[PDB]
């Protein structure tokens with residue numbers, strides 16, 4: 001199965017998923033001097049007040065905090081988006097050390113981790129159908145740097161002990177994702193793909209410029225998770241990030257000057 005190891009990592013994915021070498025793959029390096037401010041971009045709208053979390057799951061490569069997307073509650077609109085995108089889940093990518101972990105990079109700078117809030121275009125009916133469309137998903141990416149603790153992230157941190165190994169899940173209701181957002185919604189956007197297999201090119205990426213700060217203790221607990229299943233040799237869940245891919249025929253647009 002695909003993973004992030006030497007024999008099943010990012011450099012191997014193309015064999016089972018040829019699209020890995022496609023024309024709009026993610027992540028990418030964001031060259032802040034080449035990104036162009038775009039006035040055609042409408043205001044970004046993040047409406048998470050009615051978000052309903054359900055549970056958290058360790059899927060063997062990261063952990064997903066799932067939400068009830070059977071109704072329009074937590075939605076992302078505006079910005080480069082047309083229509084309404086419903087929040088289905090969020091997860092993170094992190095490193096073994098503070099100097100690495102993020103998937104997107106800024107002027108080649110790697111952050112300690114990266115938060116991905118995944119949303120799907122409601123005009124497609126369901127997530128499975130949305131991922132087969134060029135504009136099926138919108139992922140809001142947020143960088144994490146080590147410094148002060150992020151109060152809104154602690155609830156996630158303290159439940160990780162209960163889902164240490166692959167396949168384990170735990171009830172995770174009443175979690176408010178608004179607590180993971182930085183002050184500014186300034187962002188960069190470009191057409192890309194899922195950063196994990198099947199690497200489908202169905203994502204409109206919206207990466208926030210302002211990172212949130214998390215404590216060393218908080219990220220340390222992320223690093224205590226396991227890639228392996230219960231009762232198997234321990235393989236710490238770290239460095240579950242895909243490196244920057246060729247930008248190719250794409251221009252990254254900035255919402256700010």
Ligand SMILES: Nc1cc(C(F)(F)F)c(S(N)(=O)=O)cc1S(N)(=O)=O
Pocket residue numbers: 062064091116117118137139193194195196197203
């Ligand atoms: N866009 C998306 C969709 C999924 C999906 F699988 F849920 F579809 C995942 S996953 N494998 O980590 O859950 C990850 C992403 S990402 N890293 O591009 O934000």
Ligand SMILES: [Zn+2]
Pocket residue numbers: 091092093116195
């Ligand atoms: Zn991701």
